[PDB]
Curated annotation (Swiss-Prot), chain A:
Additional information: Present with 2020 molecules/cell in log phase SD medium.
Name this protein carries in UniProt: U3 small nucleolar RNA-associated protein 21
PROSITE patterns tied to this protein: WD_REPEATS_1, WD_REPEATS_2, WD_REPEATS_REGION
Presence of the UniProt keyword Acetylation in the record: yes
Pfam families assigned to the protein according to its UniProt record, in alphabetical order: Beta-prop_WDR36-Utp21_1st, Beta-prop_WDR36-Utp21_2nd, Utp21
One annotated Gene Ontology cellular component of this protein: nucleoplasm
Curated annotation (Swiss-Prot), chain B:
Note: Present with 5800 molecules/cell in log phase SD medium.
Organism: Saccharomyces cerevisiae (strain ATCC 204508 / S288c)
Subunit structure: Interacts with snoRNA U3. Interacts with MPP10. Component of the ribosomal small subunit (SSU) processome composed of at least 40 protein subunits and snoRNA U3.
Gene: UTP7
Record's protein name: U3 small nucleolar RNA-associated protein 7
Transmembrane segments: none
Entire-sequence positions represented here: 112 to 277 of 554
Ranges for the WD repeats: 1-38, 119-158
The organism's place on the tree of life at top rank: Eukaryota
Subcellular location: Nucleus, Nucleolus
Function: Involved in nucleolar processing of pre-18S ribosomal RNA.
UniProtKB/Swiss-Prot annotation, chain C:
Residues bearing the modification Phosphoserine: S629, S642
GO BP term (any one): septum digestion after cytokinesis
Organism field: Saccharomyces cerevisiae (strain ATCC 204508 / S288c) (Baker's yeast)
Protein's name in the database: Periodic tryptophan protein 2
Cellular compartments annotated: Nucleus, Nucleolus
UniProtKB/Swiss-Prot annotation, chain D:
Assembly information from the UniProt record: Component of a heterotrimeric complex containing IMP3, IMP4 and MPP10. Interacts with snoRNA U3. Component of the ribosomal small subunit (SSU) processome composed of at least 40 protein subunits and snoRNA U3. Interacts with the SSU processome subunits EMG1, IMP3, IMP4, KRR1, NOC4/UTP19, NOP1, RPS4A, RPS4B, RPS6A, RPS6B, RPS7A, RPS7B, RPS9A, RPS9B, RPS14A, RPS14B, UTP1-UTP18, UTP20-UTP22 and UTP25.
Protein's UniProt name: U3 small nucleolar RNA-associated protein MPP10
Name of the gene: MPP10
Cellular location(s): Nucleus, Nucleolus
Record's function text: Involved in nucleolar processing of pre-18S ribosomal RNA. Required for the early cleavages at sites A0, A1 and A2 during 18S ribosomal pre-RNA processing.
Organism whose genome encodes this protein: Saccharomyces cerevisiae (strain ATCC 204508 / S288c)
Family: Belongs to the MPP10 family.
Domain of life: Eukaryota
RNA sequence: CAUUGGUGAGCAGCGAAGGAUUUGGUGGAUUACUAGCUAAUAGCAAUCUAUUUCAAAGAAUUCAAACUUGGGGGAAUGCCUUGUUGA
């Protein structure tokens, strides 16, 4: 189900899945394109950096991918996609319903074999374009000619032919004439791999019993045979730097190296990959180079290099064994636990069922590193126990990282499967720590926590007892015994003052921490499986057994929300970093988001794999989920970091749904109300002469003399919205009826209609220079109409109790500009009556005066005395 | 940085200068280096004087003169911003030009600044020595080559080689 | 409480890079060091983006929809930001030093000059979700031979005209079909081509170079093949062109030189419209408004930023900041503006909302060490290294008082009386405290008794007892007033720097060189409690030093601390890039803020990249200063053993990161920190962070609007207070009628009183409902103004925010209506006859 | 100046100078910086100075 | 009688087909991942060459250029500037 909060971003931590990768060569560099489920990833073979990730997820799993110079051909369910720089350039739909499962690219031809033993040839249109695009013909390998097609290759200098490797036979097609040129003799065991040798017209075949055949595709014979008993052969590669070595790759994870010239066996790299995940799945020599890139199904991609020989005269007979070079990797099993290492959303800690703790980078995949399990020395000097054959720690149930004292001492505290002590780790060194905290009651560790001072770690055992250790020195400090069944959640305040524990007997205990008292105990109605403490708002959420999420605050110890709606057991949940939402995930294959202000479910995602872990970033950037299948970490980005989402409940006052309140324009008509605008407009209007006199430069600029006089008007054709660039619209006063301004025309029309609302709207609209320039030109000479129309317009204005500081400054600007003519023809009847009714409305403005007098006087008295 | 290369006048010694600071005088055909000094200001050019035994390097501003093993012998207070050094081996003269518009001939044997000449054409973009008659061809930002001698305070010849600079 | 976010960056209006305007050119975007500041010049306000480049930024552009910004730093790490959501969309590393980036006029493409390649990418949407790779490359053209200095798009987003250090300029069509219309190159300049522009009709091309020639290129015949028709020259002899721009619609060429002089021309006729000078430093940036009426200039050496309208010859703003040289700050007694005392010898009074400087004061002839307000924002005292304390009226802007000693010492800290009769100042070379009367000017006393340099002074604000603390490991309490002459010395474990004093004068918190903050009861001189802070300090590693950041003893202590105004917290900073705040009852770290992630400053990284450490020295101590294009930055005039002098050119090391003063805001829940990058202002806001106060399951926004619709107004108000949701409090607050404001305000419970007071303050500063807000203030002060008086320090920042509303908008309005009443009475009551 | 900067500005100040300053009267709007706002609209001379 | 001094001889305890210390080399991180080359709107990458040439454009009396000097004193012969005689 599509979401409206979180949108999928990437699935990190994945390197390969055991599709045989492709190598490609731009110039003299090499790239390695490996499939990770439904995307591929391009790596820079000189340093194994992630160059590209394919832009969209394919609708099914990529099953065969190849790479010529700039282009990558990825075959999934039915069709072949041609990709450049990740972005897909073309899509070739095959005309079948059979799944395409092999392909080769040579010449103008792309040849794609399906699983019904048909081969689809595609041709370029004109030999100058970039990829084969048009349909050409179809080839078929029927049951008479050969078995199931096991490989599809083109060995060089073969003019528009194709070597098709079936399970028993080797056919050779001419793909222009559609013909079957040559069908070899049969092979007494089923051949699994093929690789063309750099020797001319020789292919190398690898069988399901242990032998490599060196078939000569022009003579029709076999040149030689190499026998590796009880080993199924999964890869073949050839060295092409003047050393004739072959490298075979065996599905028990072995990489065997042969000299073909002197027929010896150079070396065997044993357990180069896991047999259980496929063995070595693709191994290839980068050509001209002594480095070979292997990749296996255990989510790992390695490089091995041949050093030059140690004998200075012999060389060819003293071949130094291949050593390890760079490699990338991830988890080989799906991860079991997830945490974010820091507030920047840069690193994230991740523990899997293959008993490894990785630290994956969300910024650059080269920085992903496995936290080392090499133990320290014992503190007294005694021996440490354990097996000599070192294995990894039991798989991680829980962990808690708090990098307040990071680099200083131990930083991560982690709890493993069915063992009675919690290890520590250091994230700075990326290694284990010196301390393993015991539970001291012969119970397994069910929960861990640690304080945000970084001094204290908390262990919660399955016999219901919290033990508090010091993270620096590793010793027991305190031990609380409240619960009698397993303690599944411990957390503590951001001020180390109250801790909160929850057990699966369904009691939440509230303890003071500095004093060792309990503050209270609250019995819920189900066993509690998981706690998450949002630490700034002091609200913690519990996943109860009755499939509800109880949100309870620690200050006043009440259940403050209870979220219902999950149909099966809640696997995980986590708070938003602002603490507004809580995202949960449960075994009904769903992920929900709850707005705990309103208490309802904002969004729901039906996801096909069950999400076992959900974590927000400590900024509001990302959600990280972890599912049942898939070795990586699925990463989502909340779209509500860029837009605002409606907190309106899904199933199966728009300002209050979008958490806003646009403040209304005036609350009551008998209430004074300033303008909706900047507060400084009053001061700019009242003192814009002295402000501009300040703003002048100290001496006059150096102009020219042959400057055009109408420079302000002589523009071209971002349009000017000043009072100077104002045109008249559509028999001699100061402004004729063709040359009336907008202000004077609206003032006259308002004097006709006795309603100056449009005049005052224009006045509140335009700028201070325009306001001064309109008020300063108001026909103060013979009958005084425009002055008195402005005055009773301001009267009609400040009768309405809106914008009234602007109407006050407009009256101040009137008295300043030409109050001398009003003083001159004082006792004129029209202007005296206009000022009279202006004072009649304006004398009710002392409400503001004695209101601010009361507030100032009493506020001063209350604050000081 | 990018390495200005210089060979001794018989091909026995190599003198490289990094742009950053790395000046190395070495016997490139044996494996013997005899000076590797990291002068952490931006060096520009170097040359040998009459031997592998002394070399002059043009540093951030001042031209310095180092002995065979790399100890500093001289800091030249003239030669204010050199970018091009060249030694005149029959005359024992270190010739210096650069971002200043000045060309300076310095006698290495006596120690005496022989000539200061105003190019009067801005910074010196290129510089070469005629091995035949030891006159200096400097290329300016006019597209003008000028042939100079340490006797005449004016160029002996001015040629209009290119457009733009040289 | 503790949930502060980076709000603002006062000081430093410009550092390095290009100024940009908006499309509707109301805001200007200014590259401060690795942030970006945006100053809205009409709505008088300002903000700084939260994100942070790791080096100094060098290029800015945002498209003319205003919807997204892209900022590139000085080694090509681009950052694409959503401009409206203020959140960063993508981090994209171009591999080398990008000189310019420009969006197209139609918004859909952007191009940039990375090295000598012009590369055009196409803009991702703002409506699309974030992808792994949102940028899709259009093309990359390589025809220049040296580095490209400028881009210019055409009016239709169809051609792009680039200028290089190589002495040419080229025109490239965007798409392949118009390749024949745009394939020419423009030679003929003697120096670097600094700009190349089209005319309005895209027929003429103007190419301006560094030496001072502007060429007019036209498609004429001597066939038709882009002749040069006229060369005009600036004839500025010593100076040369540093920045060029052209407004094609008004035909306005604006050119700034390396001498501070800028000239602006009307281009195809080449007539000098104006010529005037920013100063003496070079003009690093010119930018022009979309209507061409405003020109924003930036000089990078003094950090100054003009925007200037050239028609009405007048400066819209002429501001200048201070990089790295800021010794002290002080909030105004209402938190409206911050006074900055800076090492080049001057006082600068910066408005906080609008991020600009109102007044500046230069009467100290040396580095001003301390500023402090007194007489409730009327007077301001400062002490400097030139031997003087002096007092400043902030009404008439006059230095009316100057206090010197008799011994010719330099003063490092001061403290004034509450009842400002006496100023007090202490030095770092004299061991005495100098006590001056302010009414007369004389030296009232010299207090003696420290045996070490008096590092810090503070007067208790209530009982007026002086507390000094000095490097002889001793805090000392002087009863000066009224016949006592009493001295109480409290010893402490190590030498003290930054004492601070509680708002009630009961306790004093000292910071020591061990790394601790000890808190003492003044009257009974015994220690109340200490915080051990030297293990939650981020001390980075410098480039020059040969000892790790773990074992360093450079900055694991706080040189400035400050109490919160409820007395419950301490903010603290030092010569390290962490500022930490604590709550003094529990002595635990509330939050630690990383003050810089700029790698151009020194003490930022704790671990230095081992690739940069070579066989002889690190590669960042190598001075590549002679690889520079001109003499004025090939010059080294840095005299050798100089630390904390002046003139950043004269110190030869990278500027270290340090906070020199921290202060809490007296009115609204924030603090300012005087770092080297500027005045960092960290503030909370209540719009985000759902933090309720004892809500239950029946307390809901739905329940609150049902109680509002059913008009239980007090129940709706307390439900919104228990939600603590700002929109709900505002909705209920505006829905309560005037008839029953005093009943609700009398029945508000006492735990929700500071919430409604601080809400009314932060609402009423900018809200228009002036009589409504004053009715609420009058009702609250009348109904519950005894609880406030007996709980002063709870409402000490909520009441200072309220009388920041009464005297600063309401009293200005009342002044205007009063003057109108009196001018009416004069103009109608008197005799105008002849 | 360069001795102070070399000395890393720990120095000993100049002795004393009772100088003489003439201030004209003007609005303190005009005595400010160039920005849209202002801080005080008084006149730089007191009533007892006028 | 103390060593909270050196060198040893041994117990208890810890303790899974061994334990401790020291060191050389390489690989990965040490900034936030959009691929190599070139004469670059494309080619190459097995190769640029036997199309790499023409045309056009393109030249400031700026025909000015040490913003680059440790201090005092001088400068025969130089060099700079100004005048001058003779061509």
């Amino acid at each position: 189900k599509n979401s409206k909060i979180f949108s999928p971003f990437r699935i990190i931590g994945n390197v390969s899945n055991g599709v045989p990768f492709a190598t490609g060569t731009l110039g003299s560099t090499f790239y390695i394109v490996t499939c990770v489920g439904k995307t591929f990833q391009i790596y820079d073979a000189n340093t194994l950096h992630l160059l590209f990730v394919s832009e969209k997820e394919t609708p099914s799993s990529i099953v065969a991918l190849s790479a010529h110079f700039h282009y990558v051909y990825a075959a999934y369910e039915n069709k072949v996609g041609i990709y450049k720089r990740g972005i897909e350039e073309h899509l070739l739909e095959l005309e079948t319903d059979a799944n395409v499962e092999h392909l080769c690219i040579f010449g103008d031809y792309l040849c794609a074999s399906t699983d019904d033993n048909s081969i689809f040839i595609y041709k370029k249109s004109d030999p100058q374009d970039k990829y084969p695009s048009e349909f050409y013909t179809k080839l078929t390998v029927t049951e008479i000619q050969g078995g199931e097609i096991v490989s599809l290759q083109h060995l060089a200098t073969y003019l528009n032919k194709l070597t098709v490797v079936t399970k028993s036979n080797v056919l050779l097609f001419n793909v222009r004439t559609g013909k079957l040129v040559f069908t070899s003799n049969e092979f007494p065991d089923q051949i699994t791999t093929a690789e063309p040798a750099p020797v001319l017209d020789i292919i190398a075949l690898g069988t399901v019993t242990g032998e490599v055949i060196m078939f000569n595709m022009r003579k029709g014979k076999r040149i030689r045979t190499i026998k590796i008993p009880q080993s199924r052969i999964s890869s073949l590669s050839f060295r092409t730097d003047g050393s004739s070595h072959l490298s075979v790759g065996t599905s028990s994870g072995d990489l065997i190296f042969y000299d073909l010239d002197r027929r010896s066996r150079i070396h065997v790299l044993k357990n180069i990959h896991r047999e259980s995940y496929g063995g070595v799945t693709q191994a290839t020599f980068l050509n001209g180079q002594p480095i070979i890139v292997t990749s296996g199904g255990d989510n790992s991609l390695k490089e091995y290099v041949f050093d030059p020989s140690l004998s200075q005269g012999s060389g060819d007979v003293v071949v130094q064994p291949p050593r390890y070079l760079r490699s990338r990797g991830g988890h080989s099993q799906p991860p079991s636990y997830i945490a974010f290492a820091d507030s920047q959303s840069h690193f994230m800690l991740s523990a899997s069922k293959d008993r490894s703790l990785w630290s994956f980078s969300l910024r650059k995949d080269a920085q992903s590193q496995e936290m080392s399990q090499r133990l320290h020395k014992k503190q007294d000097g005694g021996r440490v126990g354990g097996s000599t054959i070192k294995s990894k720690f039991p798989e991680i149930v829980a962990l808690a990282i708090e990098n307040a004292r990071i680099g200083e001492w131990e930083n991560i505290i982690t709890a493993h499967k069915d063992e009675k002590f919690a290890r520590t780790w250091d994230m700075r060194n990326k290694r284990v720590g010196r301390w393993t905290f015991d539970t001291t009651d012969d119970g397994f560790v069910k929960s861990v926590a640690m304080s945000q001072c970084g001094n204290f770690g908390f262990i919660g055992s399955s016999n219901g007892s919290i033990t508090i250790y010091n993270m620096q020195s590793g010793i027991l400090r305190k031990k609380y015994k409240l619960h009698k069944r397993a303690v599944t959640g411990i957390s503590l305040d951001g001020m180390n003052r109250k801790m909160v524990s929850c057990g699966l007997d369904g009691i939440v205990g509230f303890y003071d921490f500095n004093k060792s008292t309990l503050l209270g105990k609250l019995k819920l109605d189900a066993p509690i499986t998981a706690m998450v403490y949002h630490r700034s708002s002091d609200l913690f959420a519990l996943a109860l057994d009755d499939l509800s999420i109880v949100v309870i605050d620690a200050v006043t110890q009440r259940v403050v929300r209870q979220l219902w709606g999950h149909s099966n057991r809640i696997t995980a949940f986590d708070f938003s970093p602002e603490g507004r939402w809580i995202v949960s995930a449960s075994l009904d294959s769903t992920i929900r988001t709850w707005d705990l202000p309103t208490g309802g479910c904002i969004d729901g995602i039906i996801v096909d794999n069950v999400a076992t872990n959900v974590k927000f970033s400590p900024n509001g950037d990302l959600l990280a989920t972890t599912h049942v299948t898939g070795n990586g970490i699925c990463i989502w980005t909340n779209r509500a970091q860029f837009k605002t989402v409606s907190t309106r409940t899904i199933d199966e006052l728009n300002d209050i749904d979008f958490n806003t309140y646009t403040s209304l324009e005036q609350i009551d008509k008998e209430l004074l109300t300033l303008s909706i605008g900047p507060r400084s407009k009053m001061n700019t209007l009242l003192h814009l002469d002295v402000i501009r006199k300040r703003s002048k430069p100290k001496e006059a600029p150096k102009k020219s003399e042959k400057l055009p006089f109408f420079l302000q008007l002589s523009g071209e054709k971002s349009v000017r919205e000043g009072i100077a660039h104002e045109t008249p619209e559509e028999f001699k006063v100061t402004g004729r009826l063709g040359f009336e301004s907008h202000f004077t025309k609206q003032l006259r029309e308002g004097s006709q209609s006795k309603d100056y609302s449009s005049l005052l709207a224009t006045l509140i609209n335009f700028s201070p220079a325009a306001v001064d320039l309109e008020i300063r030109s108001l026909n103060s000479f013979e009958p005084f109409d425009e002055i008195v129309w402005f005055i009773d317009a301001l009267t009609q204005g400040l009768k309405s109790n809106k914008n009234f500081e602007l109407y006050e400054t407009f009256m101040s600007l009137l008295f300043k500009a030409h109050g001398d003519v009003i003083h001159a023809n004082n006792k004129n009847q029209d202007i005296a009556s206009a000022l009279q009714n202006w004072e009649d409305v304006h004398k009710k403005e002392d409400r503001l005066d004695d209101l601010v007098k009361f507030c100032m006087g009493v506020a001063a008295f209350v604050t000081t005395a | 940085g990018p390495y200005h290369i210089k060979y001794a006048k018989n091909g026995t010694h190599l003198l490289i200068t990094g742009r950053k600071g790395h000046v190395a005088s070495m016997d490139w055909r044996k494996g013997q280096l005899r000076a590797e000094l990291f002068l952490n200001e931006t060096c520009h050019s170097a040359t040998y004087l009459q031997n592998e035994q002394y070399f002059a390097v043009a540093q951030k501003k001042y031209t310095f003169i180092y002995d065979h093993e790399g100890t500093e012998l001289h800091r030249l207070k003239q030669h204010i911003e050199a970018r091009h050094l060249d030694f005149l081996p029959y005359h024992y003269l270190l010739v210096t030009a650069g971002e200043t518009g000045w060309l300076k001939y310095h006698d290495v044997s006596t120690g005496q600044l022989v000539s200061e000449l105003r190019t009067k054409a801005g910074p010196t973009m290129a510089m070469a020595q005629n091995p035949w008659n030891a006159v200096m061809h400097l290329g300016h930002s006019n597209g003008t080559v000028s042939l100079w001698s340490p006797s005449m305070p004016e160029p002996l010849v001015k040629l209009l080689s290119a457009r733009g600079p040289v | 409480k503790s949930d502060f976010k980076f709000s603002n960056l006062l000081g430093t209006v410009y550092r390095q890079g290009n100024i940009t305007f908006s499309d509707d050119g109301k805001q200007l975007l200014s590259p401060v060091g690795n942030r970006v500041s945006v100053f809205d010049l009409i709505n008088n306000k300002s903000f700084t983006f939260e994100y942070e480049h790791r080096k100094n930024i060098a290029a800015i552009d945002l498209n003319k929809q205003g919807t997204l910004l892209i900022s590139i730093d000085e080694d090509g790490r681009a950052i694409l930001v959503n401009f409206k959501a203020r959140n960063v969309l993508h981090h994209f590393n171009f591999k080398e030093k990008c000189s310019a980036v420009k969006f197209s006029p139609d918004g859909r493409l952007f191009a940039l000059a990375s090295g000598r390649f012009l590369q055009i990418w196409k803009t991702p949407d703002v409506n699309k979700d974030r992808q792994f790779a949102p940028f899709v490359r259009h093309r990359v053209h390589a025809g220049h031979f040296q580095d490209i200095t400028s881009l210019t798009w055409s009016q239709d987003s169809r051609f792009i005209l680039t200028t290089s250090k190589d002495l040419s300029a080229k025109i490239w069509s965007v798409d392949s079909e118009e390749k024949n219309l745009a394939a020419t190159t423009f030679n003929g300049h003697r120096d670097y081509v600094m700009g190349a522009f089209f005319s309005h009709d895209q027929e003429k091309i103007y190419t301006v170079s560094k030496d001072g020639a502007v060429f007019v290129w036209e498609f004429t015949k001597r066939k038709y093949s882009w002749r040069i028709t006229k060369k005009h020259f600036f004839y500025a002899n010593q100076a040369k062109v540093k920045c060029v721009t052209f407004h094609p619609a008004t035909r306005l060429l604006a050119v700034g030189f390396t001498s501070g002089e800028f000239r602006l021309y009307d281009l195809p006729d080449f007539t000098l419209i104006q010529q005037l000078s920013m100063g003496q430093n070079p003009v690093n940036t010119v930018s022009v408004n979309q209507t061409g009426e405003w020109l924003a200039f930036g000089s990078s050496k003094l950090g100054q930023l003009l925007v200037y309208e050239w028609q009405s010859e007048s400066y819209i703003l002429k501001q200048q900041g201070h990089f790295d040289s800021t010794n002290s700050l002080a909030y105004s007694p209402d938190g409206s503006r911050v006074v900055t005392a800076s090492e080049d010898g001057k006082i600068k009074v910066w408005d906080i909302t609008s991020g600009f400087c109102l007044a500046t004061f230069e009467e100290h002839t040396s580095s001003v060490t301390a500023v402090q307000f007194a007489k409730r924002g009327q007077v301001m005292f400062s002490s400097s290294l030139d031997g003087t304390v002096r007092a400043w009226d902030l009404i008439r802007y006059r230095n009316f008082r100057t206090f010197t000693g008799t011994e010719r010492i330099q003063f490092n800290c001061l403290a004034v009386d509450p009842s400002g009769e006496v100023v007090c100042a202490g030095s770092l070379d004299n061991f005495d405290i100098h006590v001056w009367s302010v009414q007369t000017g004389q030296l009232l006393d010299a207090l003696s008794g420290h045996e070490g340099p008096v590092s810090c002074l503070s007067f208790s604000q209530e009982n007026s007892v002086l507390a000094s603390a000095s490097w002889d490991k001793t805090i000392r309490i002087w009863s000066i007033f009224g016949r006592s002459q009493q001295v109480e010395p409290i010893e402490v474990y190590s030498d003290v720097l930054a004492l601070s004093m509680r708002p009630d004068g009961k306790e004093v918190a000292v910071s020591t060189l061990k790394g601790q903050i000890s808190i003492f009861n003044i009257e009974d001189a015994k220690q109340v409690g200490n915080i051990d802070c030297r293990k939650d300090i981020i001390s980075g590693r410098f480039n020059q030093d040969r000892f790790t950041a773990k074992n360093s003893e450079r900055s694991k202590f706080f040189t400035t601390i400050h109490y919160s105004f409820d007395g419950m917290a301490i903010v603290a900073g030092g010569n390290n890039n962490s500022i930490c705040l604590y709550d003094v009852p529990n002595e635990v770290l509330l939050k630690r803020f990383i003050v810089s992630r700029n790698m151009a400053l020194n003490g930022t990284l704790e671990f230095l990249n081992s690739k940069k450490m070579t066989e002889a020295g690190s590669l960042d101590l190598i001075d590549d200063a002679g690889e520079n294009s001109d003499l004025e930055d090939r010059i080294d005039n840095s005299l050798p053993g100089s630390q904390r002098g002046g003139d950043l050119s004269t110190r030869k090391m990278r500027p270290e990161v340090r906070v020199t003063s921290v202060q809490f805001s007296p009115t609204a829940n924030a603090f300012a920190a005087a770092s080297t990058e500027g005045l960092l202002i960290y503030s909370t806001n209540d719009t985000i962070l759902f933090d309720p106060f004892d809500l239950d399951v029946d307390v809901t926004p739905h329940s609150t609007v049902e109680a509002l619709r059913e008009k239980q107004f007090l129940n709706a108000l307390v439900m919104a207070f228990r939600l603590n949701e700002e929109y709900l409090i505002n909705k209920v607050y505006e829905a309560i009628p005037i008839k029953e404001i005093p009943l609700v305000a009398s029945n508000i419970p006492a735990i929700y009183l500071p919430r409604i007071l601080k809400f009314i303050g932060d609402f009423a500063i900018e809200s228009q409902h002036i009589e409504f807000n004053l009715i609420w203030i009058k009702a609250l002060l009348s109904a519950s103004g005894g609880y406030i008086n007996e709980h002063k320090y709870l409402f000490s920042t909520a009441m200072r925010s309220i009388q920041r509303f009464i005297v600063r908008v309401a009293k200005e309005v009342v002044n205007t209506t009063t003057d109108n009443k009196y001018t009416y009475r004069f103009l109608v009551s008197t005799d105008g006859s002849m | 100046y360069k001795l102070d900067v070399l000395s890393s500005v720990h120095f000993v100040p100049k002795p004393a100078s009772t100088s003489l300053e003439i201030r004209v009267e003007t609005p303190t709007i005009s005595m400010e910086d160039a920005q849209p706002l202002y801080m005080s609209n008084a006149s730089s001379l007191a009533p007892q100075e006028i």
